Amino acid sequence: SQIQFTRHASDVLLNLNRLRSRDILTDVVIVVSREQFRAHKTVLMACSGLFYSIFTDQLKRNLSVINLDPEINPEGFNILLDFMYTSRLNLREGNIMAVMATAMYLQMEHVVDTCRKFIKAS
Amino acid sequence: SQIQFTRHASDVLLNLNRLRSRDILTDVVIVVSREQFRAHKTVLMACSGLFYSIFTDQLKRNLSVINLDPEINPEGFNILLDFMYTSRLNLREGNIMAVMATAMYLQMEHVVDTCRKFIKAS
Ligand SMILES: Cc1cc(-c2cn(CC(=O)Nc3cc(N4CCOCC4)ncc3Cl)c3ncn(CC#Cc4cnn(C)c4)c(=O)c23)cc(C#N)c1O
Ligand SMILES: Cc1cc(-c2cn(CC(=O)Nc3cc(N4CCOCC4)ncc3Cl)c3ncn(CC#Cc4cnn(C)c4)c(=O)c23)cc(C#N)c1O
After folding, report:
1. Which of B4, B12, B39, B95 gives the lowest tally of CB atoms within 10 Å of its CB?
2. How many domains in chain A?
3. What is the dihedral of CA A65, A111, B1, B4, to 10 degrees?
4. Helix, strand or coil for residue A2?
5. Alpha carbons A21 and A17: distance in angstroms, whole number
6. Which range of residues forms the domain containing residue B73?
């Protein structure tokens, strides 16, 4: 019975990305080898099984720094972080393997499955 | 050139609402007369000109309690808060005026315009 606003969720996500771009209310830095990326824990939890499992635990919920596995490619992480905030996944031949492995680690199944589709289509 | 995930933003918003329902990483209580509502400031900012203007200001960004105008109907606020987190607006004959006035106060134009449409259609 409710009126549905079909662009609202996309508009929210765009505004959340705008807040990230201005470092407004970001509450964690994710450290990936020599690079650092600020984010909102709520968005990370919404998009990643790894981050969900980390921050749901009261033991870890208040952490302000998360150090990822040093084997994780920073570019691959950046691609996925941008995906979380945009719904747009930049997959190429040159990044597919890194992106797929990073998405497995972050526990992002739809991206992993899309990577499998990308592989099949080339 | 990016692959588009058409359900991702909706899925993010659903997960943010799930976090709200469990009081996970909520960072503000909004006080509306005798009622209180917990939320994520980032979502409020993403959906409301009033909350955007409040929390962007470094003077007010860290506030944990916001007291709304005592004239604001708590039910009307609740309807709009649920809209922010769901994209679904519960407009009825019995709540339209309160919802419209609350949306004006919260600076949520698309809802206000939809309220104007609802009035025109009855
Ligand atoms: C929106 C979105 C979410 C997830 C995704 C999020 N999460 C975390 C999660 O589930 N969070 C929440 C769950 C609930 N619940 C609802 C009520 O019932 C219980 C849960 N409530 C609030 C939050 Cl924040 C994910 N967690 C796991 N996976 C799966 C995976 C994987 C994988 C791939 N390879 N490997 C090794 C593992 C997800 O995809 C997401 C992945 C993608 C992708 N790709 C995506 O576009
Ligand atoms: C997604 C969504 C947003 C807004 C809405 C949000 N905001 C706050 C805002 O604009 N936040 C941000 C803006 C930017 N910028 C992008 C780059 O350029 C600058 C801005 N970046 C990040 C954030 Cl969080 C709104 N603020 C104002 N209004 C308009 C109004 C009104 C009104 C109605 N009656 N009265 C008296 C006032 C909005 O609708 C929204 C309203 C609705 C509705 N209905 C809706 O479904």
Report:
1. B4
2. 1
3. -100
4. coil
5. 6
6. 1-122
